[PDB]
Design a binder for this molecule. Structure first.
Ligand SMILES: [Mg+2]
Ligand SMILES: [Mg+2]
Ligand SMILES: [Mg+2]
Ligand SMILES: [Mg+2]
Ligand SMILES: [Mg+2]
Ligand SMILES: [Mg+2]
Ligand SMILES: [Mg+2]
Ligand SMILES: [Mg+2]
Ligand SMILES: [Mg+2]
Ligand SMILES: [Mg+2]
Ligand SMILES: [Mg+2]
Ligand SMILES: [Mg+2]
Ligand SMILES: [Mg+2]
Ligand SMILES: [Mg+2]
Ligand SMILES: [Mg+2]
Ligand SMILES: [Mg+2]
Ligand SMILES: [Mg+2]
Ligand SMILES: [Mg+2]
Ligand SMILES: [Mg+2]
Ligand SMILES: [Mg+2]
Ligand SMILES: [Mg+2]
Ligand SMILES: [Mg+2]
Ligand SMILES: [Mg+2]
Ligand SMILES: [Mg+2]
Lengths: 55, 185, 141, 54
RNA sequence: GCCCUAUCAACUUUCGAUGGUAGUCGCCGUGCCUACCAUGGUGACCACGGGUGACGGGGAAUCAGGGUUCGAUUCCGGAGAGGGAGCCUGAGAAACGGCUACCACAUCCAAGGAAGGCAGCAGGCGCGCAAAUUACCCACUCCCGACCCGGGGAGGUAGUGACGAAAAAUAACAAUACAGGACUCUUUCGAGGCCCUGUAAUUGGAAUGAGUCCACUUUAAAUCCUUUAACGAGGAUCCAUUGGAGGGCAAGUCUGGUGCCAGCAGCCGCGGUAAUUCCAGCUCCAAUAGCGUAUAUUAAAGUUGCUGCAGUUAAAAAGCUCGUAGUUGGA
């Protein structure tokens, strides 16, 4: 309807964002990505998960 | 009616299919290995190799004793030998087709800084060449995309060091009048 | 082809030169009265003046009331149903203002669930709407 | 260049360079107040051109 | 040697249309124009008439080969200075930063009268989705003159400038605090290392500019860059955003709210009381000083098909023969 405007954003739960260390950029980000792919870890067992797979 | 140039040209080809899974790997090992800062330097090298190959694949289209092929293929092999990829014993225009990407990355000066043992790591290289610590043949060098003059040379020419003695005052000359004379004495 | 002679050029070219006119993307873009009857007139943006705030139902499986703004344009004087993209950003639009309308993106064609609404809203009163929505900017009071 | 003669300097040397060492005074009025002096000296014909300027 | 149209198929001609003769004008050749005679000239091989968001050509972007689309815009060649006609000086102009009149727009006035033209550089008004300093100088390249010597908003140098294009910061290391491995082992675990990868906001004194800026230098006068002295950073707070995380298409069945409501989504699709797609946290991705959203457009399109398409039922061959142009024609 036109009389329910702004219901959910108006009525969510506002939580302040966090405050942490900055992320390295430039080549140093690319280097950390290189560091978490090939040279140190092995395929351990079974399938391969995703890098965000908190399950 | 002005007197200018008006001439520029791009030197990187974005690919055609964007999200192949296998290309981002090989094009990540070619970053983590030679210590690069983005993907444009990769696309820029592959396009300079494509320019070399496609001209060669135009000359091999030509019969033997072509007066064009004689002059062009022979001065091409001069332009690759003096940047020192092909073996000078191998002046033969069939070995161009077997030429990968690493034939230029190994000749980058950032690796010849790592391999000549005049550094510590590879990522210490770009910080050297940033901080005006080297030269080549009495000419100071500031750039890691400077494959030049395969007959090469080392550092330094002339640079007087004083970064921290000409830093904090010997760690001696600071405590004369700071909280000492105006307090107890 | 069907005729294959050596001097049959004015037959081929005066056959292709007719049968090109039965294309749809050639006839709409090239000569014809589509550029004539474009409300923009062959351009990518247009300013307008709001006159009313209305809502439009949605089509099938869906059940909602999307939000639209009746706009009269400057350079012609025609009337357009726009669209308010984000959540609740109808409450920042007051009557008789100026909005900067951009085409939606399916080249003047109905999209998604919304029946017959071509155009959307980008800027309001020379204040960008992503900043008015986020909070980087503020309406000029 | 040559070292030949002091007097060939002013003969075959441009006057912006003599004033590096310093031998040449330049003008002190710009070109905007010269063009308006010139055109205001163009309206009138007669002796009084010298009478209207500065 | 050229763009679209047959819902333009017949045109021109005592209003010179096509030709013959003698003249006039004009720099010369001719219906260019008068005087007298003849009745002819173009056209389905597309004349005539109408449109063009048409200035033309050198060329630009994508492309296998073929081609499509763009060329207002710095070089050559023509046209025009509000609109249209007229003419002087002059070798050369129907000139407009030269004059004479009309129409439209327009200034100062003592009300008798006078004068004007930015589609020259700057700068305002306007119209717009839509585009910069009312700055400095003849030194460079060159042009004009009576001329070595005076001039030139042509031109040059600066200011604005994320159209775009090139190169390129935001960290580097060492000691032992934790894991992982070929290498020596030890029945495994440990350990032992000719070589470690590293992982923590762990600790150490390293190596520099961005900036600050004296002094040259540069330049006609200055500035930037360039060279250098002093200065100048450890959460080095001198701090990287834009989009996204069902599939196509890289990447969360993490947690808390609403409960077919508000909304996302280019396409399929999500939401009705446990939503991996909504508003937010945490985490994760792709590009990186750049990235998305519109529109015009080319390739992909053998979905305009000459190379290279279809026509029984899906869109598709006139109801049937004859027939002038056309196209193709045996040995
Ligand atoms: Mg991919
Ligand atoms: Mg054919
Ligand atoms: Mg639909
Ligand atoms: Mg032209
Ligand atoms: Mg083709
Ligand atoms: Mg085409
Ligand atoms: Mg010309
Ligand atoms: Mg006249
Ligand atoms: Mg004229
Ligand atoms: Mg004038
Ligand atoms: Mg006027
Ligand atoms: Mg003009
Ligand atoms: Mg002069
Ligand atoms: Mg000029
Ligand atoms: Mg700049
Ligand atoms: Mg400099
Ligand atoms: Mg998206
Ligand atoms: Mg998200
Ligand atoms: Mg996507
Ligand atoms: Mg297209
Ligand atoms: Mg088909
Ligand atoms: Mg049918
Ligand atoms: Mg039938
Ligand atoms: Mg029938």
């Amino acid at each position: 309807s036109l009389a329910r405007v702004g219901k959910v954003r108006g009525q969510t739960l506002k939580v302040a964002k966090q405050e942490k260390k900055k992320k390295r950029t430039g080549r140093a980000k690319r280097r950390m990505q290189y560091n978490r792919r090939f040279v140190n870890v092995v395929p351990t067992f079974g399938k391969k998960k995703g890098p965000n797979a908190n399950s | 009616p002005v007197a200018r140039s008006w001439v520029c040209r791009k030197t990187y080809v974005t690919p055609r299919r964007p999200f192949e899974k296998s290309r981002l790997d090989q094009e990540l090992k070619l970053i983590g290995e030679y210590g690069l800062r983005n993907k444009r330097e990769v696309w820029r090298v592959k396009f300079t190799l494509a320019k070399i190959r496609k001209a060669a694949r135009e000359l091999l289209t030509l019969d033997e004793k072509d007066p064009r092929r004689l002059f062009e293929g022979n001065a091409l092999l001069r332009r690759l030998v003096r940047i020192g990829v092909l073996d000078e014993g191998k002046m033969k225009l069939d070995y161009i087709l077997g030429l990968k990407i690493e034939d230029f990355l190994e000749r980058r000066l950032q690796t010849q800084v790592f391999k000549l043992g005049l550094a510590k790591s590879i990522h210490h290289a770009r910080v050297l060449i940033r901080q005006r610590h080297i030269r080549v043949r009495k000419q100071v060098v500031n750039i890691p995309s400077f494959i030049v003059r395969l007959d090469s040379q080392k550092h330094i020419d002339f640079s007087l060091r004083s970064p921290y003695g000409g830093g904090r005052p010997g760690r001696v000359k600071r405590k004369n009048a700071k909280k000492g004379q105006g307090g107890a004495g | 082809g069907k005729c294959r002679g050596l001097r049959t050029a004015r037959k081929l070219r005066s056959h292709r030169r007719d049968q090109k006119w039965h294309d749809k993307q050639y006839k709409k873009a090239h000569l014809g009265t589509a550029l004539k009857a474009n409300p923009f007139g062959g351009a990518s943006h247009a300013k307008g003046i709001v006159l009313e705030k209305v809502g439009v139902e949605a089509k099938q499986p869906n059940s909602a009331i999307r939000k639209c703004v009746r706009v009269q344009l400057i350079k012609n004087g025609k009337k357009i149903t726009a669209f308010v993209p984000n959540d609740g950003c109808l409450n920042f639009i007051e009557e008789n203002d100026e909005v900067l309308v951009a085409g939606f993106g399916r080249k003047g064609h109905a999209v998604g669930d919304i029946p017959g609404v071509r155009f959307k809203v980008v800027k309001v009163a020379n204040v960008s709407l992503l900043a008015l929505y986020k909070g980087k900017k503020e309406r000029p009071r | 260049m040559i070292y030949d003669s002091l007097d060939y300097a002013k003969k075959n040397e441009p006057k912006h360079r003599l004033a590096r060492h310093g031998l040449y005074e330049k003008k002190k009025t710009s070109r905007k107040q010269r063009k308006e002096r010139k055109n205001r000296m163009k309206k009138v014909r007669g002796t009084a051109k010298a009478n209207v300027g500065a």
